[PDB]
Write a protein that binds this DNA or RNA. Sequence first.
RNA 1: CGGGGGAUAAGCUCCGUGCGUCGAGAGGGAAACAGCCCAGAUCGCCGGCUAAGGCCCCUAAGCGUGUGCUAAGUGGAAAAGG
RNA 2: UGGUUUGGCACCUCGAUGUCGGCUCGUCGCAUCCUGGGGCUGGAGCAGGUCCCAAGGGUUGGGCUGUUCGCCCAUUAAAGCG
RNA 3: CAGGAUAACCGCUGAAAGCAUCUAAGCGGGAAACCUCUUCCAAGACCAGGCUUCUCACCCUCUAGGAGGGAUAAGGCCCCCC
Lengths: 214, 176, 146, 37, 23, 62
Amino acid sequence: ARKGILGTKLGMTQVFDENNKVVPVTVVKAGPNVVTRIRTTERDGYSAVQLAYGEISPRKVIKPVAGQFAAAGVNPRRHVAELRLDDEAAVAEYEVGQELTAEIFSDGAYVDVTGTSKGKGFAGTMKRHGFRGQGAAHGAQAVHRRPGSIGGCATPGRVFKGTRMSGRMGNDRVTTQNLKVHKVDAENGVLLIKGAIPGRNGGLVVVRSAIKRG
Amino acid sequence: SRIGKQPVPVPSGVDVTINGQNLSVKGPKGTLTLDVAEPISVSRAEDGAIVVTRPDDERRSRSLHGLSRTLIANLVTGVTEGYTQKMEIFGVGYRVQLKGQNLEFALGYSHPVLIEAPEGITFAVESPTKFSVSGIDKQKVGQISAVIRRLRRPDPYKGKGVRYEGEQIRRKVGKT
Amino acid sequence: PTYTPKAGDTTRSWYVIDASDVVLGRLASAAATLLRGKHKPTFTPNVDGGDFVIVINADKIAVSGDKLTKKFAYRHSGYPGGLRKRTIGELLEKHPTRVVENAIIGMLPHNKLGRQIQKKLKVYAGPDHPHAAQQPIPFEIKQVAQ
Amino acid sequence: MKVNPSVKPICDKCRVIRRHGRVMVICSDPRHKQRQG
Amino acid sequence: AKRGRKKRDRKHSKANHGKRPNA
Amino acid sequence: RINAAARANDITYNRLIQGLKAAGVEVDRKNLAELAVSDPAAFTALVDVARAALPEDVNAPS
RNA sequence: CGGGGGAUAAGCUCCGUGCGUCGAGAGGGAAACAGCCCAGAUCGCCGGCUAAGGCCCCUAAGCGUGUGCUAAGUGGAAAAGG
RNA sequence: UGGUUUGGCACCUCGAUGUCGGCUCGUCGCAUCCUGGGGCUGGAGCAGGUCCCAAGGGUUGGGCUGUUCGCCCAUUAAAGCG
RNA sequence: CAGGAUAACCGCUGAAAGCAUCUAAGCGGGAAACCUCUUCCAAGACCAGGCUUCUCACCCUCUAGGAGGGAUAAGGCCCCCC
Ligand SMILES: [Mg+2]
Ligand SMILES: [Mg+2]
Ligand SMILES: [Mg+2]
Ligand SMILES: [Mg+2]
Ligand SMILES: [Mg+2]
Ligand SMILES: [Mg+2]
Ligand SMILES: [Mg+2]
Ligand SMILES: [Mg+2]
Ligand SMILES: [Mg+2]
Ligand SMILES: [Mg+2]
Ligand SMILES: [Mg+2]
Ligand SMILES: [Mg+2]
Ligand SMILES: [Mg+2]
Ligand SMILES: [Mg+2]
Ligand SMILES: [Mg+2]
Ligand SMILES: [Mg+2]
Ligand SMILES: [Mg+2]
Ligand SMILES: [Mg+2]
Ligand SMILES: [Mg+2]
Ligand SMILES: [Mg+2]
Ligand SMILES: [Mg+2]
Ligand SMILES: [Mg+2]
Ligand SMILES: [Mg+2]
Ligand SMILES: [Mg+2]
Ligand SMILES: [Mg+2]
Ligand SMILES: [Mg+2]
Ligand SMILES: [Mg+2]
Ligand SMILES: [Mg+2]
Ligand SMILES: [Mg+2]
Ligand SMILES: [Mg+2]
Ligand SMILES: [Mg+2]
Ligand SMILES: [Mg+2]
Ligand SMILES: [Mg+2]
Ligand SMILES: [Mg+2]
Ligand SMILES: [Mg+2]
Ligand SMILES: [Mg+2]
Ligand SMILES: [Mg+2]
Ligand SMILES: [Mg+2]
Ligand SMILES: [Zn+2]
């Protein structure tokens, strides 16, 4: 129904289309993964499949997680996530212990990307929210970049909870939809995605089959 | 009242059964069900007729008596004979044709328009400019007739569209 | 002096009320009075003396008039322009028990005594309940002629 | 759809009916057709 | 306005017999 | 408290007080309350006495 | 209550009334509300009888009794007119 | 009906209620500018006149007067009223 | 995009009231308006949710009613390079 696969962001690079075009792409290493658990309606109340990724030494992991993985019947891994399906026929396809690779996708099929944004740190209003400052000369009094008026006078007499103003930004989940896929390399198990995707070098990223149009 | 007083006749070739308030009728054309309003009771005459009686002469009873009588008459006549309607199309370059259970219209739009045929009804076409629709339930027949009629906007100038058998449309002439 | 309740003289009980073809006002009044324990002769306002109650088959509640579409339950999240509304028909369609829960909550004092009291009520939608192990006693709404 | 607080049978062919609490008159002549509100 | 009509109309409660200070 | 006890014993408070007045027993609300919390049998006896002393029809124009 | 000034407007102003109240007045009644209704505080009592208003629960007392009207949440905002 | 302009009353604030536009930043109503859906025409069609429902989004940049108001210069769907 | 129920409007079957009528019983169509459908937060939601794995055992004291103190496993924290 809706296929999915984990991976990691690597960097940027160019590729030239057969029609002699130019299109920047991103390199994503969708490494092999394993299935550790399956969620069924009568057991949990929904349908989804659990995945795992990453190579870690056995002594790193903690004992409860090690025991869970041993009961599942696979070696330890670093990260774990799940894909939420919509029916029972689809989940019937997946079984515990199965191995998935990047081949599952085909070129020309639009997908979605999920990840975390950058860390920008505390920032001013004009930068975080794109306010417009005021005159930098002709009689300023050190109000070059501060917003200014904030609300009414005695009616109602508050700040109208939800007003847009200064505060920290970034470091949150962000997703983009219907991104074109250019080429797939089997031996290297890497993806070439047109455009730019969120995240940082050596970060975590999960890609899913397109919903809007796919 | 005045219209509900007369018992509904029943022909020999129709079966009638009563189960409390619910009523079902079996005939050559098929069978149908019905639920009756509780304020009014229904009785069957031994002389092959149906009698509907009202307990009191207030407004609701006076209204429902005639409704029940006429509805019973309509359903019995429908199950006995049925209902059919004929349609005709006027204009230039207007056509219609039958494709299985589905029917398509050509009113001159850029793209063709198709109408699906729900259950219990059938469409019959004898000429490219005239067709007919048949069914058992008068309400369904009328609904489908209105839906087919409303395909094209009224045209009081050239009369292009679909018109009933005896239906006459007002026409006004534009000098300019 | 007048009698007062001691540390451990209070005793509770289990009650169940059906809601098949009954009027919401009567059901709410009966539930409120039972919760408060006005019937028990050991009433004292300062300490609760209520009794457990179970309500079953909430979806069959009958309401007179056109209230199915002309009565509206309102609530507001808090941000500006966040006042959105729902109708009783959709409320029953989606959450059967919400209407009765809200009615009983409104039918009781809004102080913290009542806030603690509302813990005393459990309301269900289906004709069954997993609380059969405590042997609830059936109850019926009745009028005392005078 | 002439909307006025008051309506009348402008010509003999106007007939008055009541719908959903609002009374309006229907007639063959559209000019003669109006509703109150 | 709306404010004025309320107090004068609210004076017609049978409790006060219809006569109240300040209309 | 008295109203609760009477309603439990299947008689209204107003009719109970009317019966007490008719029988001419002058005991006070505090006494009734204490007796009810203490002696349900005595409360029932008093209620029966009041019911017996009640007139025929409460709706009569008398 | 009977009047003048006013646009027969003001919670406006100026008069007369063996006229009420507040001002110098607690309680109860109408959600809150000095000028409206009942009612004039010597003090104590874990006692009875009542005015105004109320008796589905909030909140004490009637989901009182008998005869009639209401389809509009009219009940719980107003006029020429239809 | 609205209390939004010009007005009448002096009831709260002279041991202080700091003042017109502009800049930045909102929020709300509909008596609707477009965007949406209908109907009646002295509606060939494009295009017009009028009425009904509808508040999700948008509503430019310049010259002149401090100006509010107002006039003018070039496009877009519009350069909405409070 | 698609689906559900709606305002303005267009309807089918129909007595009161032998006729007629979109209605008082019923059944239908109909929009950036409303509800799901898009992204994010979210069990301090006190009804404090659900599926799993890990340890599930050593003492003392007051007076044996419980509580307090000390010593441990799972884990966590402090310091250190980033
Ligand atoms: Mg930005
Ligand atoms: Mg700047
Ligand atoms: Mg400075
Ligand atoms: Mg500066
Ligand atoms: Mg006129
Ligand atoms: Mg006056
Ligand atoms: Mg006077
Ligand atoms: Mg005068
Ligand atoms: Mg004065
Ligand atoms: Mg004077
Ligand atoms: Mg005095
Ligand atoms: Mg006083
Ligand atoms: Mg008082
Ligand atoms: Mg005195
Ligand atoms: Mg008395
Ligand atoms: Mg009295
Ligand atoms: Mg009480
Ligand atoms: Mg009653
Ligand atoms: Mg009567
Ligand atoms: Mg009202
Ligand atoms: Mg009037
Ligand atoms: Mg008239
Ligand atoms: Mg003054
Ligand atoms: Mg003052
Ligand atoms: Mg002052
Ligand atoms: Mg000063
Ligand atoms: Mg100021
Ligand atoms: Mg100023
Ligand atoms: Mg409007
Ligand atoms: Mg238009
Ligand atoms: Mg027009
Ligand atoms: Mg609008
Ligand atoms: Mg919006
Ligand atoms: Mg100048
Ligand atoms: Mg008719
Ligand atoms: Mg008709
Ligand atoms: Mg919890
Ligand atoms: Mg540790
Ligand atoms: Zn006419």
